[PDB]
């Protein structure tokens, strides 16, 4: 379970701000799309609108901070749950080909606000890459994400 502590609220605000690039306190479909596109995805307007509709209690077409937190309360689970690890793999695997490359990892990490140095990227890939193909598949990813 997550708590509404000052520290946690600040973390959620950081996430909200990633989307709310104009700082107007609302996340639009345009803003959702810009972030997803930065991760190699190209969702339809329908897909973007559906995400808003999940928590758009006032029906104004955008997500405000309370609605965003309602989404987090509904969706968020343990960091090592099966569904969070599969969803994390899909995000890092920009092209959906079943392997996370160094280029993908670097791109996704910086566009989500946690830029890695090339040394941090190479280190993560090297250590997670058990089969030696230079990339990280789902099974390797699970191992990396669960190993303590």
């Amino acid at each position: 379970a997550y708590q509404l502590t000052e520290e946690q609220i600040a973390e959620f605000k950081e996430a909200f701000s990633l989307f709310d690039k104009d700082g107007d306190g609302t996340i639009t479909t345009k803003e959702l799309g810009t972030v997803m596109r930065s991760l190699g995805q190209n969702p339809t307007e329908a897909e973007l609108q559906d995400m808003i509709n999940e928590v758009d209690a006032d029906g104004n077409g955008t997500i405000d901070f309370p609605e965003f937190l309602t989404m987090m309360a509904r969706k968020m689970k343990d960091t090592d749950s099966e569904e969070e690890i599969r969803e994390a793999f899909r995000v890092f695997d920009k092209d959906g080909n079943g392997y996370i490359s160094a280029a993908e990892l670097r791109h996704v990490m910086t566009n989500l606000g946690e830029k890695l140095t090339d040394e941090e990227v190479d280190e993560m890939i090297r250590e997670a890459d058990i089969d030696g193909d230079g990339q990280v598949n789902y099974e390797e990813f699970v191992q990396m994400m669960t190993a303590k």
Partner: peptide, 19 residues
């Protein structure tokens, strides 16, 4: 280790659930 800690940071602020 450090890259993994950063991934955990992204998870705990909900960015995997959003993306």
């Amino acid at each position: 280790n450090k890259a993994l800690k950063k991934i955990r940071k992204l998870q705990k602020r909900g960015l995997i659930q959003m993306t």
